[PDB]
Amino acid sequence: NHNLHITEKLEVLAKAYSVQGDKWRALGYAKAINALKSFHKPVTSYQEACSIPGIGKRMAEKIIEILESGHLRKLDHISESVPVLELFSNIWGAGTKTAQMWYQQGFRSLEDIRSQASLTTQQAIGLKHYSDFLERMPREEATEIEQTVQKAAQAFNSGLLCVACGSYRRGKATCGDVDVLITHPDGRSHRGIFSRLLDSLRQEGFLTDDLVKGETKYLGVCRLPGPGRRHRRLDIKVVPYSEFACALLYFTGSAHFNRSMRALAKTKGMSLSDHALSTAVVRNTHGCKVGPGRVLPTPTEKDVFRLLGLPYREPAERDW
DNA sequence: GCCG
DNA sequence: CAGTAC
DNA sequence: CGGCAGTACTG
Ligand SMILES: Cc1cn([C@H]2C[C@H](O)[C@@H](COP(=O)(O)O)O2)c(=O)[nH]c1=O
Ligand SMILES: [Ca+2]
Ligand SMILES: [K+]
Ligand SMILES: [K+]
Ligand code: NA
Ligand code: NA
C-alpha cells in the first residue's frame, strides 16, 4: 500500500516491456510489483528489498535508485513506440504481434487503423467499442447483466445455476467485464444450452456482437436497455457439474492468483486447470505434461485448497 | 525480470 | 500452427 | 540453464 513511490514507476517499465513483446521480463516486473504491493513497511534498504520473494539484485538496485533520487533513469530511455503500441494493443483481439506489425507498417493512430489497417472480425468489434471496453462498470450494473443472463437461462430450465465470477465475485466496486458461469446439478442438462440461450438474449437486443462462440465459452458484447447505457464485455461459460468448483476458482481469479495456485500444484506432482485438479501428473524436464494422471474429486473450492495443503482464501482475498 |  | 484472451 | 499456468478458439 505504502510503496507507491516505487510501484508507480516500476509499472511504467513493466507495461513498456509488455507491449513490446518481452513477456517474461514483464512477468518479472509484474511479480515484483505485486510483492511490493503487499509488504508491511516501505522498503528502505537494499538488503531489505532482497528479503522479499520476487525481488532480486537488479530490482532492488532500481528500488534504491528511486529513494536516493526520486526518479528512475530507465524511464527516460523508453522507446517512442511504446505509447503507440499500447494504443494499438488496447484493441480487443490485437496483441503485441499485431501492434508491432501495424507500427512497422507506419500506422500511428486509431484513424490510421480505421482507414488502412487489415482487421480481423474480432478486432473490428474491438475497435468499434474501443472507449467502452477501457471502462470499468459499477458493480450494480454487473448485477443487472448477471440477472439478465440468469433470467433468460432459467426460463429454459429453472434448474440452471448461474454465477457471475471475476472481480465481481471478488467483491470489487467496479468490474472490467462480466463472466457468468453456468452449470446444472443433474450433471447433464447443461448440454446444448447455448443455441437457445444466446438466441433469447439476442432477440431482445441485449447481445450486440459475438467475439467467440465455442462449445463451452461464449465471449461477446452486451448493452442493457434504455438511455445512458454503454456496451460491455460479457462472457458465458457452460461447464458440467463435476467441474464446477475448478471452473468457479479459475474464472473468479485473479489471474496472478490462478497462476500461483497452478505453479504450486505443479511442484506437488499435481496439475490444476479450469476443468479439474489432477494428481500423479507425469511431466518431462521442460515442465511439459506427458502423462495425464487422475482427476481428484473437488465438490467445492475448499477441496482444491485442502488437496493442495493450503488454508482456504475467500474470493475477496485473491487479488494476488 | 526472478528463481530453483 | 501462431496469436490472443480467458 | 531454462521455465515462468493451463486451456479454448480462430483462421
Ligand atoms: C486476463 C486473464 C484472466 N485470467 C482469468 C482470471 C480472470 O478472472 C478470468 C476472466 O478474465 P476477465 O476478467 O479478463 O474476463 O480469467 C487468466 O487466467 N489469465 C489472464 O491473463
Ligand atoms: Ca474481472
Ligand atoms: K527475494
Ligand atoms: K481498416
Ligand atoms: Na488487445
Ligand atoms: Na468478459
mmCIF file of C-alpha atoms (C1' of nucleotides) and ligand atoms in Angstrom:
data_model
loop_
_atom_site.group_PDB
_atom_site.id
_atom_site.type_symbol
_atom_site.label_atom_id
_atom_site.label_comp_id
_atom_site.label_asym_id
_atom_site.label_seq_id
_atom_site.Cartn_x
_atom_site.Cartn_y
_atom_site.Cartn_z
ATOM 1 C CA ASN A 1 0.000 0.000 0.000
ATOM 2 C CA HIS A 2 2.756 2.393 1.019
ATOM 3 C CA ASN A 3 5.365 1.652 -1.670
ATOM 4 C CA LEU A 4 3.588 3.555 -4.473
ATOM 5 C CA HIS A 5 6.728 5.722 -4.606
ATOM 6 C CA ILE A 6 8.256 2.663 -6.311
ATOM 7 C CA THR A 7 5.450 0.597 -7.834
ATOM 8 C CA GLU A 8 4.128 3.551 -9.832
ATOM 9 C CA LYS A 9 7.450 3.896 -11.619
ATOM 10 C CA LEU A 10 8.076 0.155 -11.965
ATOM 11 C CA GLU A 11 4.655 -0.252 -13.586
ATOM 12 C CA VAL A 12 5.692 2.025 -16.427
ATOM 13 C CA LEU A 13 8.596 -0.289 -17.271
ATOM 14 C CA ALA A 14 6.562 -3.484 -16.917
ATOM 15 C CA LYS A 15 3.920 -2.124 -19.317
ATOM 16 C CA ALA A 16 6.653 -0.979 -21.719
ATOM 17 C CA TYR A 17 8.163 -4.477 -21.828
ATOM 18 C CA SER A 18 4.680 -5.996 -22.140
ATOM 19 C CA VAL A 19 3.567 -4.063 -25.256
ATOM 20 C CA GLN A 20 6.974 -4.658 -26.850
ATOM 21 C CA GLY A 21 6.537 -8.426 -26.551
ATOM 22 C CA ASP A 22 9.158 -9.037 -23.835
ATOM 23 C CA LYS A 23 6.687 -11.186 -21.952
ATOM 24 C CA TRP A 24 8.942 -12.894 -19.403
ATOM 25 C CA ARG A 25 10.738 -9.743 -18.327
ATOM 26 C CA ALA A 26 7.343 -8.082 -17.912
ATOM 27 C CA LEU A 27 6.295 -11.102 -15.856
ATOM 28 C CA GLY A 28 9.248 -10.463 -13.550
ATOM 29 C CA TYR A 29 8.284 -6.822 -13.091
ATOM 30 C CA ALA A 30 4.611 -7.698 -12.589
ATOM 31 C CA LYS A 31 5.588 -10.135 -9.841
ATOM 32 C CA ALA A 32 7.887 -7.695 -8.049
ATOM 33 C CA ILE A 33 5.141 -5.070 -8.235
ATOM 34 C CA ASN A 34 2.690 -7.442 -6.542
ATOM 35 C CA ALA A 35 5.319 -8.336 -3.939
ATOM 36 C CA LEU A 36 5.898 -4.649 -3.158
ATOM 37 C CA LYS A 37 2.139 -4.041 -3.135
ATOM 38 C CA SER A 38 1.879 -6.486 -0.189
ATOM 39 C CA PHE A 39 4.863 -5.931 2.133
ATOM 40 C CA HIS A 40 4.405 -4.477 5.621
ATOM 41 C CA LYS A 41 6.663 -1.387 5.656
ATOM 42 C CA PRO A 42 8.012 0.951 2.978
ATOM 43 C CA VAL A 43 11.240 -0.616 1.754
ATOM 44 C CA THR A 44 14.235 1.494 2.785
ATOM 45 C CA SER A 45 17.399 -0.609 2.271
ATOM 46 C CA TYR A 46 18.962 -2.706 -0.490
ATOM 47 C CA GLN A 47 19.172 -5.753 1.780
ATOM 48 C CA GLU A 48 15.615 -5.155 2.957
ATOM 49 C CA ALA A 49 14.459 -5.453 -0.663
ATOM 50 C CA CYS A 50 16.177 -8.768 -1.466
ATOM 51 C CA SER A 51 14.390 -10.232 1.554
ATOM 52 C CA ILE A 52 11.067 -10.123 -0.356
ATOM 53 C CA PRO A 53 10.242 -13.150 -2.563
ATOM 54 C CA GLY A 54 10.222 -11.875 -6.126
ATOM 55 C CA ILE A 55 12.765 -9.043 -5.724
ATOM 56 C CA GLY A 56 16.349 -9.637 -6.797
ATOM 57 C CA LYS A 57 19.574 -7.737 -7.261
ATOM 58 C CA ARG A 58 18.547 -5.803 -10.374
ATOM 59 C CA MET A 59 15.098 -4.975 -8.982
ATOM 60 C CA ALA A 60 16.475 -3.938 -5.582
ATOM 61 C CA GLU A 61 19.019 -1.637 -7.256
ATOM 62 C CA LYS A 62 16.183 0.174 -9.026
ATOM 63 C CA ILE A 63 14.274 0.305 -5.717
ATOM 64 C CA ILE A 64 17.125 2.274 -4.135
ATOM 65 C CA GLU A 65 17.754 4.497 -7.160
ATOM 66 C CA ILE A 66 14.179 5.675 -6.584
ATOM 67 C CA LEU A 67 14.706 6.588 -2.922
ATOM 68 C CA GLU A 68 18.151 8.159 -3.378
ATOM 69 C CA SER A 69 16.898 10.068 -6.450
ATOM 70 C CA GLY A 70 13.077 10.051 -6.547
ATOM 71 C CA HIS A 71 13.357 9.058 -10.229
ATOM 72 C CA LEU A 72 14.378 6.022 -12.281
ATOM 73 C CA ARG A 73 16.720 6.729 -15.176
ATOM 74 C CA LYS A 74 15.373 3.859 -17.312
ATOM 75 C CA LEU A 75 12.085 5.750 -17.740
ATOM 76 C CA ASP A 76 13.911 8.359 -19.848
ATOM 77 C CA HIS A 77 15.024 5.749 -22.405
ATOM 78 C CA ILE A 78 11.684 4.068 -23.161
ATOM 79 C CA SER A 79 11.147 3.771 -26.894
ATOM 80 C CA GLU A 80 8.964 6.396 -28.569
ATOM 81 C CA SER A 81 6.940 3.499 -30.000
ATOM 82 C CA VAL A 82 5.548 2.365 -26.632
ATOM 83 C CA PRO A 83 2.588 4.801 -26.336
ATOM 84 C CA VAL A 84 1.563 3.825 -29.857
ATOM 85 C CA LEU A 85 1.958 0.077 -29.210
ATOM 86 C CA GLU A 86 -0.173 0.440 -26.072
ATOM 87 C CA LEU A 87 -2.825 2.314 -28.045
ATOM 88 C CA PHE A 88 -2.928 -0.459 -30.659
ATOM 89 C CA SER A 89 -2.905 -3.380 -28.242
ATOM 90 C CA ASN A 90 -5.782 -1.885 -26.240
ATOM 91 C CA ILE A 91 -7.974 -3.079 -29.134
ATOM 92 C CA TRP A 92 -9.652 -6.323 -28.074
ATOM 93 C CA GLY A 93 -8.206 -9.086 -30.269
ATOM 94 C CA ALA A 94 -4.994 -7.205 -31.070
ATOM 95 C CA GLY A 95 -1.879 -8.129 -29.116
ATOM 96 C CA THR A 96 1.817 -7.354 -29.254
ATOM 97 C CA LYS A 97 2.434 -9.077 -32.598
ATOM 98 C CA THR A 98 -0.395 -7.245 -34.355
ATOM 99 C CA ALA A 99 0.540 -3.917 -32.740
ATOM 100 C CA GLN A 100 4.178 -4.266 -33.827
ATOM 101 C CA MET A 101 3.089 -5.167 -37.362
ATOM 102 C CA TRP A 102 0.817 -2.125 -37.620
ATOM 103 C CA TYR A 103 3.630 0.062 -36.268
ATOM 104 C CA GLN A 104 6.096 -1.351 -38.802
ATOM 105 C CA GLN A 105 3.575 -0.523 -41.495
ATOM 106 C CA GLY A 106 3.783 3.156 -40.408
ATOM 107 C CA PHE A 107 0.452 3.368 -38.555
ATOM 108 C CA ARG A 108 0.459 5.737 -35.586
ATOM 109 C CA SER A 109 -3.176 6.459 -34.650
ATOM 110 C CA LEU A 110 -6.506 4.746 -34.454
ATOM 111 C CA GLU A 111 -7.506 6.800 -37.505
ATOM 112 C CA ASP A 112 -4.690 5.028 -39.385
ATOM 113 C CA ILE A 113 -6.051 1.673 -38.170
ATOM 114 C CA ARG A 114 -9.639 2.576 -39.091
ATOM 115 C CA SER A 115 -8.798 3.675 -42.625
ATOM 116 C CA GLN A 116 -5.837 1.498 -43.661
ATOM 117 C CA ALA A 117 -5.231 -1.487 -41.373
ATOM 118 C CA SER A 118 -6.217 -5.064 -42.018
ATOM 119 C CA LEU A 119 -8.538 -6.034 -39.155
ATOM 120 C CA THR A 120 -9.909 -9.363 -38.061
ATOM 121 C CA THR A 121 -13.612 -9.705 -37.357
ATOM 122 C CA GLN A 122 -12.908 -9.618 -33.608
ATOM 123 C CA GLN A 123 -10.588 -6.621 -33.873
ATOM 124 C CA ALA A 124 -13.146 -4.538 -35.804
ATOM 125 C CA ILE A 125 -15.581 -5.164 -32.954
ATOM 126 C CA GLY A 126 -12.810 -4.273 -30.526
ATOM 127 C CA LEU A 127 -12.136 -1.008 -32.339
ATOM 128 C CA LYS A 128 -15.815 -0.065 -32.559
ATOM 129 C CA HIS A 129 -16.042 -0.297 -28.745
ATOM 130 C CA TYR A 130 -12.527 0.985 -28.059
ATOM 131 C CA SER A 131 -13.518 3.564 -25.415
ATOM 132 C CA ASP A 132 -16.255 1.447 -23.833
ATOM 133 C CA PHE A 133 -14.011 -1.592 -23.281
ATOM 134 C CA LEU A 134 -11.397 0.527 -21.470
ATOM 135 C CA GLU A 135 -14.037 1.486 -18.840
ATOM 136 C CA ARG A 136 -14.955 -0.423 -15.691
ATOM 137 C CA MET A 137 -18.648 -0.566 -14.808
ATOM 138 C CA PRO A 138 -20.170 -0.116 -11.333
ATOM 139 C CA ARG A 139 -20.810 -3.472 -9.740
ATOM 140 C CA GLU A 140 -24.548 -2.669 -9.657
ATOM 141 C CA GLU A 141 -24.562 -2.744 -13.459
ATOM 142 C CA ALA A 142 -22.709 -6.063 -13.341
ATOM 143 C CA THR A 143 -25.527 -7.400 -11.158
ATOM 144 C CA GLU A 144 -28.076 -6.318 -13.768
ATOM 145 C CA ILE A 145 -26.120 -8.057 -16.502
ATOM 146 C CA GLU A 146 -25.806 -11.287 -14.496
ATOM 147 C CA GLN A 147 -29.522 -11.113 -13.644
ATOM 148 C CA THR A 148 -30.354 -10.692 -17.320
ATOM 149 C CA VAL A 149 -28.471 -13.865 -18.216
ATOM 150 C CA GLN A 150 -29.819 -15.869 -15.261
ATOM 151 C CA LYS A 151 -33.428 -14.985 -16.106
ATOM 152 C CA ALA A 152 -33.045 -15.984 -19.741
ATOM 153 C CA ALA A 153 -31.271 -19.239 -18.796
ATOM 154 C CA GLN A 154 -33.673 -20.203 -16.003
ATOM 155 C CA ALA A 155 -36.534 -19.622 -18.467
ATOM 156 C CA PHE A 156 -35.455 -22.788 -20.345
ATOM 157 C CA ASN A 157 -34.680 -24.789 -17.222
ATOM 158 C CA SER A 158 -35.045 -23.327 -13.724
ATOM 159 C CA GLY A 159 -32.500 -25.916 -12.550
ATOM 160 C CA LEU A 160 -29.600 -23.950 -14.046
ATOM 161 C CA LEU A 161 -27.157 -22.325 -11.615
ATOM 162 C CA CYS A 162 -25.719 -19.003 -12.772
ATOM 163 C CA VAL A 163 -22.830 -17.270 -11.001
ATOM 164 C CA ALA A 164 -21.045 -14.089 -12.036
ATOM 165 C CA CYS A 165 -17.343 -14.552 -11.346
ATOM 166 C CA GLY A 166 -14.267 -12.368 -11.790
ATOM 167 C CA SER A 167 -13.741 -9.134 -9.928
ATOM 168 C CA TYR A 168 -17.485 -9.066 -9.301
ATOM 169 C CA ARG A 169 -17.208 -12.216 -7.178
ATOM 170 C CA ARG A 170 -14.006 -10.923 -5.590
ATOM 171 C CA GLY A 171 -16.274 -8.087 -4.287
ATOM 172 C CA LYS A 172 -14.829 -5.150 -6.246
ATOM 173 C CA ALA A 173 -16.721 -1.869 -6.552
ATOM 174 C CA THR A 174 -16.203 -1.740 -10.335
ATOM 175 C CA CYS A 175 -15.875 -4.573 -12.857
ATOM 176 C CA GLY A 176 -13.967 -4.562 -16.130
ATOM 177 C CA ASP A 177 -16.434 -7.095 -17.542
ATOM 178 C CA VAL A 178 -18.890 -9.819 -16.530
ATOM 179 C CA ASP A 179 -18.360 -13.613 -16.693
ATOM 180 C CA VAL A 180 -21.435 -15.738 -15.985
ATOM 181 C CA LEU A 181 -20.597 -19.366 -15.140
ATOM 182 C CA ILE A 182 -23.484 -21.771 -15.807
ATOM 183 C CA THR A 183 -23.936 -25.389 -14.733
ATOM 184 C CA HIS A 184 -26.698 -27.856 -13.771
ATOM 185 C CA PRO A 185 -26.638 -30.183 -10.725
ATOM 186 C CA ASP A 186 -28.239 -33.013 -12.656
ATOM 187 C CA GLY A 187 -24.903 -33.354 -14.443
ATOM 188 C CA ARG A 188 -26.385 -33.405 -17.959
ATOM 189 C CA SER A 189 -28.983 -30.638 -18.587
ATOM 190 C CA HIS A 190 -26.244 -28.033 -19.170
ATOM 191 C CA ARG A 191 -25.649 -29.636 -22.589
ATOM 192 C CA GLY A 192 -26.859 -27.969 -25.784
ATOM 193 C CA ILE A 193 -27.971 -24.835 -23.929
ATOM 194 C CA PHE A 194 -26.073 -22.165 -25.911
ATOM 195 C CA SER A 195 -28.154 -22.079 -29.079
ATOM 196 C CA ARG A 196 -31.388 -21.291 -27.233
ATOM 197 C CA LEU A 197 -29.891 -19.032 -24.543
ATOM 198 C CA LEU A 198 -27.924 -16.838 -26.940
ATOM 199 C CA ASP A 199 -30.953 -16.578 -29.214
ATOM 200 C CA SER A 200 -33.092 -15.497 -26.270
ATOM 201 C CA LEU A 201 -30.516 -12.853 -25.307
ATOM 202 C CA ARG A 202 -30.123 -11.868 -28.946
ATOM 203 C CA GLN A 203 -33.829 -11.478 -29.695
ATOM 204 C CA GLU A 204 -34.270 -8.702 -27.114
ATOM 205 C CA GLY A 205 -31.245 -6.760 -28.436
ATOM 206 C CA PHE A 206 -29.213 -7.370 -25.260
ATOM 207 C CA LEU A 207 -26.332 -9.112 -27.088
ATOM 208 C CA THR A 208 -24.924 -6.776 -29.725
ATOM 209 C CA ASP A 209 -21.758 -8.502 -31.007
ATOM 210 C CA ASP A 210 -20.251 -12.016 -30.721
ATOM 211 C CA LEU A 211 -16.474 -12.402 -30.392
ATOM 212 C CA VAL A 212 -16.117 -16.125 -29.623
ATOM 213 C CA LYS A 213 -18.781 -18.863 -29.921
ATOM 214 C CA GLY A 214 -17.255 -22.166 -28.778
ATOM 215 C CA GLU A 215 -18.876 -25.326 -27.465
ATOM 216 C CA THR A 216 -18.208 -24.209 -23.874
ATOM 217 C CA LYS A 217 -17.189 -20.489 -23.963
ATOM 218 C CA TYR A 218 -19.137 -17.551 -25.334
ATOM 219 C CA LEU A 219 -17.402 -14.170 -25.440
ATOM 220 C CA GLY A 220 -19.337 -11.185 -26.698
ATOM 221 C CA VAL A 221 -20.788 -7.735 -26.163
ATOM 222 C CA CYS A 222 -23.984 -6.651 -24.441
ATOM 223 C CA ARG A 223 -25.845 -3.438 -23.642
ATOM 224 C CA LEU A 224 -28.634 -3.061 -21.108
ATOM 225 C CA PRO A 225 -31.835 -1.375 -22.329
ATOM 226 C CA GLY A 226 -32.570 2.324 -22.040
ATOM 227 C CA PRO A 227 -30.642 5.603 -22.130
ATOM 228 C CA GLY A 228 -27.260 6.175 -20.552
ATOM 229 C CA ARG A 229 -26.027 2.628 -21.261
ATOM 230 C CA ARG A 230 -22.600 1.565 -22.542
ATOM 231 C CA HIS A 231 -21.588 -1.632 -24.328
ATOM 232 C CA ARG A 232 -19.930 -4.153 -22.014
ATOM 233 C CA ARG A 233 -17.876 -7.329 -22.480
ATOM 234 C CA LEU A 234 -19.902 -10.388 -21.416
ATOM 235 C CA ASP A 235 -18.659 -13.975 -21.086
ATOM 236 C CA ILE A 236 -20.882 -17.018 -20.594
ATOM 237 C CA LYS A 237 -19.187 -20.308 -19.751
ATOM 238 C CA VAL A 238 -21.150 -23.574 -19.509
ATOM 239 C CA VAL A 239 -19.494 -26.439 -17.630
ATOM 240 C CA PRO A 240 -20.520 -29.893 -16.343
ATOM 241 C CA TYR A 241 -21.461 -30.037 -12.687
ATOM 242 C CA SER A 242 -18.392 -32.046 -11.645
ATOM 243 C CA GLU A 243 -16.027 -29.313 -12.877
ATOM 244 C CA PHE A 244 -17.956 -26.513 -11.138
ATOM 245 C CA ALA A 245 -15.527 -25.869 -8.291
ATOM 246 C CA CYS A 246 -12.446 -25.715 -10.529
ATOM 247 C CA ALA A 247 -14.338 -23.501 -13.003
ATOM 248 C CA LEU A 248 -15.542 -21.181 -10.239
ATOM 249 C CA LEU A 249 -11.973 -20.957 -9.000
ATOM 250 C CA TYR A 250 -10.385 -20.157 -12.378
ATOM 251 C CA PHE A 251 -12.987 -17.672 -13.546
ATOM 252 C CA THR A 252 -13.035 -15.862 -10.209
ATOM 253 C CA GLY A 253 -9.273 -15.208 -10.449
ATOM 254 C CA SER A 254 -7.335 -13.138 -10.029
ATOM 255 C CA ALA A 255 -5.075 -14.159 -12.921
ATOM 256 C CA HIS A 256 -1.926 -13.920 -10.798
ATOM 257 C CA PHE A 257 -3.693 -15.914 -8.116
ATOM 258 C CA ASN A 258 -4.587 -18.687 -10.601
ATOM 259 C CA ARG A 259 -1.039 -18.851 -11.906
ATOM 260 C CA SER A 260 0.477 -19.097 -8.429
ATOM 261 C CA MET A 261 -2.002 -21.809 -7.440
ATOM 262 C CA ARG A 262 -1.173 -23.742 -10.601
ATOM 263 C CA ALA A 263 2.560 -23.257 -10.114
ATOM 264 C CA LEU A 264 2.121 -24.626 -6.580
ATOM 265 C CA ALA A 265 0.180 -27.651 -7.787
ATOM 266 C CA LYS A 266 2.926 -28.421 -10.296
ATOM 267 C CA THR A 267 5.551 -28.638 -7.546
ATOM 268 C CA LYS A 268 3.433 -31.251 -5.718
ATOM 269 C CA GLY A 269 3.149 -33.517 -8.753
ATOM 270 C CA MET A 270 -0.355 -32.205 -9.448
ATOM 271 C CA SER A 271 -1.956 -30.237 -12.257
ATOM 272 C CA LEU A 272 -4.715 -27.648 -11.771
ATOM 273 C CA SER A 273 -6.955 -26.428 -14.586
ATOM 274 C CA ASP A 274 -10.374 -24.885 -15.077
ATOM 275 C CA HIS A 275 -11.586 -28.488 -15.512
ATOM 276 C CA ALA A 276 -10.093 -30.294 -12.527
ATOM 277 C CA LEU A 277 -7.323 -30.782 -10.009
ATOM 278 C CA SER A 278 -5.269 -33.750 -11.240
ATOM 279 C CA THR A 279 -2.730 -35.905 -9.400
ATOM 280 C CA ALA A 280 0.177 -38.174 -10.358
ATOM 281 C CA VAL A 281 0.793 -35.964 -13.386
ATOM 282 C CA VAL A 282 3.831 -37.245 -15.297
ATOM 283 C CA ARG A 283 5.933 -34.470 -16.876
ATOM 284 C CA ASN A 284 9.298 -34.247 -18.651
ATOM 285 C CA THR A 285 12.333 -31.998 -17.981
ATOM 286 C CA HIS A 286 10.912 -28.815 -19.575
ATOM 287 C CA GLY A 287 7.814 -28.888 -17.333
ATOM 288 C CA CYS A 288 5.613 -30.139 -20.192
ATOM 289 C CA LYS A 289 2.986 -32.769 -19.404
ATOM 290 C CA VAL A 290 3.350 -36.303 -20.823
ATOM 291 C CA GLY A 291 1.045 -38.410 -18.627
ATOM 292 C CA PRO A 292 -2.377 -37.112 -17.548
ATOM 293 C CA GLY A 293 -2.884 -38.524 -14.076
ATOM 294 C CA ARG A 294 -6.039 -38.970 -12.044
ATOM 295 C CA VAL A 295 -8.739 -36.361 -11.543
ATOM 296 C CA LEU A 296 -9.207 -35.668 -7.868
ATOM 297 C CA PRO A 297 -12.754 -35.136 -6.535
ATOM 298 C CA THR A 298 -13.353 -31.429 -5.827
ATOM 299 C CA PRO A 299 -17.023 -30.788 -4.970
ATOM 300 C CA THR A 300 -16.155 -27.328 -3.633
ATOM 301 C CA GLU A 301 -13.412 -24.769 -3.856
ATOM 302 C CA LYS A 302 -12.399 -25.618 -0.275
ATOM 303 C CA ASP A 303 -11.371 -29.064 -1.520
ATOM 304 C CA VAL A 304 -8.942 -27.565 -4.029
ATOM 305 C CA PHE A 305 -7.140 -25.659 -1.272
ATOM 306 C CA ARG A 306 -7.222 -28.687 1.046
ATOM 307 C CA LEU A 307 -5.874 -31.114 -1.552
ATOM 308 C CA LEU A 308 -3.059 -28.579 -2.107
ATOM 309 C CA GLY A 309 -2.180 -28.181 1.571
ATOM 310 C CA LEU A 310 -3.366 -24.579 1.770
ATOM 311 C CA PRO A 311 -5.619 -22.553 4.054
ATOM 312 C CA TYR A 312 -8.748 -21.573 2.180
ATOM 313 C CA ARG A 313 -8.971 -17.993 0.902
ATOM 314 C CA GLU A 314 -12.250 -16.171 0.367
ATOM 315 C CA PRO A 315 -12.800 -14.744 -3.135
ATOM 316 C CA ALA A 316 -12.097 -11.248 -1.787
ATOM 317 C CA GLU A 317 -8.648 -12.422 -0.635
ATOM 318 C CA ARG A 318 -7.424 -13.496 -4.080
ATOM 319 C CA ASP A 319 -6.084 -10.350 -5.672
ATOM 320 C CA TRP A 320 -2.626 -11.938 -5.702
ATOM 321 C "C1'" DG B 1 12.902 -9.538 -14.723
ATOM 322 C "C1'" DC B 2 13.048 -13.776 -10.687
ATOM 323 C "C1'" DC B 3 14.146 -18.192 -9.041
ATOM 324 C "C1'" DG B 4 15.371 -23.401 -8.495
ATOM 325 C "C1'" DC C 1 0.367 -23.978 -36.386
ATOM 326 C "C1'" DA C 2 0.692 -18.599 -34.162
ATOM 327 C "C1'" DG C 3 -1.807 -15.181 -31.920
ATOM 328 C "C1'" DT C 4 -4.973 -13.853 -28.419
ATOM 329 C "C1'" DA C 5 -7.612 -13.877 -24.420
ATOM 330 C "C1'" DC C 6 -9.694 -16.284 -20.728
ATOM 331 C "C1'" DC D 1 20.390 -23.453 -17.839
ATOM 332 C "C1'" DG D 2 15.907 -22.595 -18.501
ATOM 333 C "C1'" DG D 3 10.961 -22.311 -17.042
ATOM 334 C "C1'" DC D 4 7.770 -18.707 -15.760
ATOM 335 C "C1'" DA D 5 -0.347 -21.822 -15.837
ATOM 336 C "C1'" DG D 6 -3.268 -24.224 -18.390
ATOM 337 C "C1'" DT D 7 -6.634 -24.079 -21.895
ATOM 338 C "C1'" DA D 8 -10.262 -22.533 -25.760
ATOM 339 C "C1'" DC D 9 -10.878 -20.533 -30.006
ATOM 340 C "C1'" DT D 10 -9.890 -18.675 -34.608
ATOM 341 C "C1'" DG D 11 -8.347 -18.805 -39.324
HETATM 342 C C1 LIG E 1 -6.595 -11.693 -18.270
HETATM 343 C C2 LIG E 1 -6.530 -13.077 -17.682
HETATM 344 C C3 LIG E 1 -7.545 -13.631 -16.992
HETATM 345 N N1 LIG E 1 -7.496 -14.903 -16.464
HETATM 346 C C4 LIG E 1 -8.622 -15.440 -15.687
HETATM 347 C C5 LIG E 1 -8.826 -14.649 -14.395
HETATM 348 C C6 LIG E 1 -9.995 -13.731 -14.730
HETATM 349 O O1 LIG E 1 -10.739 -13.537 -13.522
HETATM 350 C C7 LIG E 1 -10.805 -14.650 -15.628
HETATM 351 C C8 LIG E 1 -11.696 -13.859 -16.535
HETATM 352 O O2 LIG E 1 -10.879 -12.911 -17.216
HETATM 353 P P1 LIG E 1 -11.529 -11.469 -17.468
HETATM 354 O O3 LIG E 1 -11.942 -10.930 -16.064
HETATM 355 O O4 LIG E 1 -10.493 -10.628 -18.162
HETATM 356 O O5 LIG E 1 -12.822 -11.750 -18.324
HETATM 357 O O6 LIG E 1 -9.790 -15.227 -16.464
HETATM 358 C C9 LIG E 1 -6.390 -15.690 -16.597
HETATM 359 O O7 LIG E 1 -6.319 -16.810 -16.120
HETATM 360 N N2 LIG E 1 -5.364 -15.133 -17.316
HETATM 361 C C10 LIG E 1 -5.326 -13.868 -17.874
HETATM 362 O O8 LIG E 1 -4.324 -13.490 -18.491
HETATM 363 CA CA CA E 2 -12.724 -9.318 -13.879
HETATM 364 K K K E 3 13.812 -12.135 -2.632
HETATM 365 K K K E 4 -9.472 -0.813 -41.912
HETATM 366 NA NA NA E 5 -5.686 -6.333 -27.171
HETATM 367 NA NA NA E 6 -15.908 -10.779 -20.114
#
